[PDB]
Symmetry: C4
Subunit: 223 residues, 4 copies
């Protein structure tokens, strides 16, 4: 079954994405004496990891690897409700297993937050929600624009375009909100670490941003 | 109307570009004790943000997202005067709103200059003008060369080519002039912060550079 | 003979890849007073070096430049056993000569480990094996997905896709295992320096990961 | 005349490349108290600047922007001797003017070496020559492989492939030799600063590497 391949692809893509990218956040200075945070390192790993997973799985599942993307696809009727529930389940499960593998292989002294996304202390949850909405909006707009079959003018790698959209979300928002853009990516390490601080914003922010982008693309700009 | 979609696209593209990219300049060490400035972080965010916005909006508006680009297009008769005034208005308005959103979500202690472009103290305004002229020249030349329909040899992503031209402008000029290349990008945070220091060079420099590049491309090299 | 060209290409590609990339690991602070380790610098050099060598030699040899890739190709019957033995020999020999050239041109005071891949002291060899398995899995999956002739949807540079897969392996795993993904790349400097610590994991980990990826791609996802 | 356009393009491409890229080397800490050297910043600026100039001028002049490339093209009979002398003149002149402009706009306190390429004190000139030979070899091989009309399999941006080859040359060799790969790029700031230390290696090394690569590509691998 093509469908079960696709669901398995979403699970595996998420597992790999989350393991590698959360892995890039590990501060090898430790919790007691943290080394400087390399924002470029993290932003590139998240962006290039998404580019790589879209390259690997785009033709098998569509390479959503993100519940907010899947929800935008449901709301624009590009995927069935039935398919969307299995994708979102696979994405959340994949994120849990990827984060769990990271936990198992990472020395306890440097695990730290295991890459959980958190709102800066000097931000409100409302401002964090807005940041996540906007960064996810631009990501989902990039996905819809890049994959639009009506276009004759798309050039170069679609996967890389999407990955660089992820990268810019991070280069801006890592210190504001952790730059989630992706409810499953936040969910995975939240489950492993039992850290649920403002967790709802990482569902509501990205999902609203994604649906707005998909809606604006499909029904306002390029119907 | 296709035209109103295009104007709205220029506004939205600028808003997102400016929010994310100015956001990358925020020094989370604060004004009292600034951490080292990561020039790669800023250069990549500006370059990849332009690449992403061109990917998203190139087919809707042409993805100028820059009054100097729009002026070069007017002077080479690629866009009408009428259209250019609405584009430039949308670009300036979008930059103001993007910078304003950044101001609202950024803790006051780290707002700093809000990414306003300023001439180094040990540079003259004249040398700043020249720097901005040259970096904008190469950017606009890249745009005209990449989009030239006569060419059969353009390979890979046009958006990424343009974004990397933005990136190199920054990797050179951030410490000289702030590497504007873009009058609206300078205008937005200037309005929010009331900081107008040498502001005219960020209009005159890029506009002259852009018109020279467009003119040289269209009428000297590739007529 | 096309075959001897291909074998010579694998040797030369490996030599250049290893010289440049191990060269990027040299800590010019010295063994006594090491400067901060730039993980981005190393990750980009390894990834972009593979992208460059695939660009240069992909059409001559297939651009494996990696015994684990070659083994995956043997197990999926994409290359003959006979050809695979000469490729693996050329790859190991090329890595030795590249690492040897690096040793000759590098001041003894900064040679350090000559970029040998080692397991972190706070990791077990088993966890190192798992890390190497997973990072090599995603790399080999990227190679099979990117080169799949059945696909009509691959966009942009195949070489760059593969290089960025290498880059993410590093951005995650440099501090865990040295991010080998490549038995020959580990073998070369091991020979020059006589450093064989946990060396077997850099054969077994990548080879298992590669065969699993090739097998899953060819027989489960995209038969 | 197409020929005079091409010569002017080589001059202008070199001017811009050298200004921006040497500009990226300026240490704003000063000669008295230098800040850490960002190798990624410099490597990306040189690589992306070449990618950008090849994008801008490849169809006008061939985008050599490098006397060693031009010599390799002469030796493989891809360009006439007559044309090669004007290209090399334009390249050297462009490099002088670009470096001179940089000197004029850069505060005297941070000019430093103006990005002159020098051999590390703990390297011999012979080892510097070898480093320059190898890094230029891989660059020129990338150019010949990327531009080979017999190939049906080249994917993505040729300009970016070449630029990333430049980038890896730097990520390896900046601290060894300054990673010239380009006699004109070394010549320009040497003229402005009157700094000729080991200057001959930056002609002989790259030229030998370039001719070997061109020769091997055209006559051994892909005749
Ligand atoms: C827009 C709807 C808002 C309803 C609140 C969601 C449920 C509350 O959930 C709580 O929210 C707090 C504030 O963010 C957080 O500090 C807690 O970690 C979280 O558990
Ligand atoms: C080439 C035309 C130059 C005319 C000067 C423009 C108007 C002056 O404007 C002023 O210029 C000063 C010098 O740059 C700046 O310091 C001030 O911030 C700016 O308000
Ligand atoms: C799965 C098969 C495991 C068999 C062990 C391989 C041969 C042992 O080899 C040794 O292994 C040690 C533990 O990694 C290392 O510390 C030594 O450096 C290595 O020589
Ligand atoms: C292979 C041919 C070598 C001949 C030497 C070239 C001319 C000498 O030139 C000198 O070489 C010295 C050693 O590199 C440098 O220290 C000097 O800066 C340079 O002027």
């Amino acid at each position: 079954q093509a469908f079960w391949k696709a669901v398995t692809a979403e699970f595996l893509a998420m597992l790999i994405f989350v393991l590698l990218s959360l892995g890039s956040t590990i501060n090898w200075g430790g919790t007691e004496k943290p080394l400087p945070v390399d924002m470029v390192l993290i932003s590139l790993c998240f962006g290039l990891s998404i580019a790589t997973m879209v390259q690997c799985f785009g033709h098998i599942s569509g390479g959503h690897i993100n519940p907010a993307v899947t929800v935008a696809m449901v709301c624009t009727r590009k995927i069935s409700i039935a398919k969307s529930v299995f994708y979102i389940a696979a994405q959340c499960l994949g994120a849990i297993i990827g984060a769990g593998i990271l936990y198992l292989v990472t020395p306890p002294s440097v695990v730290g937050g295991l890459g959980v996304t958190m709102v800066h202390g000097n931000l409100t949850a409302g401002h964090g929600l807005l940041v996540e909405l906007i960064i996810t909006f631009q990501l989902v707009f990039t996905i819809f624009a890049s994959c639009d079959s009506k276009r004759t003018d798309v050039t170069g790698s679609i996967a890389l375009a999407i990955g660089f959209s992820v990268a810019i979300g991070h280069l801006f928002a890592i210190n504001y909100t952790g730059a989630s853009m992706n409810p499953a990516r936040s969910f995975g390490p939240a489950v492993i670490m039992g850290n649920w601080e403002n967790h709802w914003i990482y569902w509501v922010g990205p999902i609203i941003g994604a649906v707005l982008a998909g809606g604006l693309y499909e029904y306002v700009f390029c119907p």
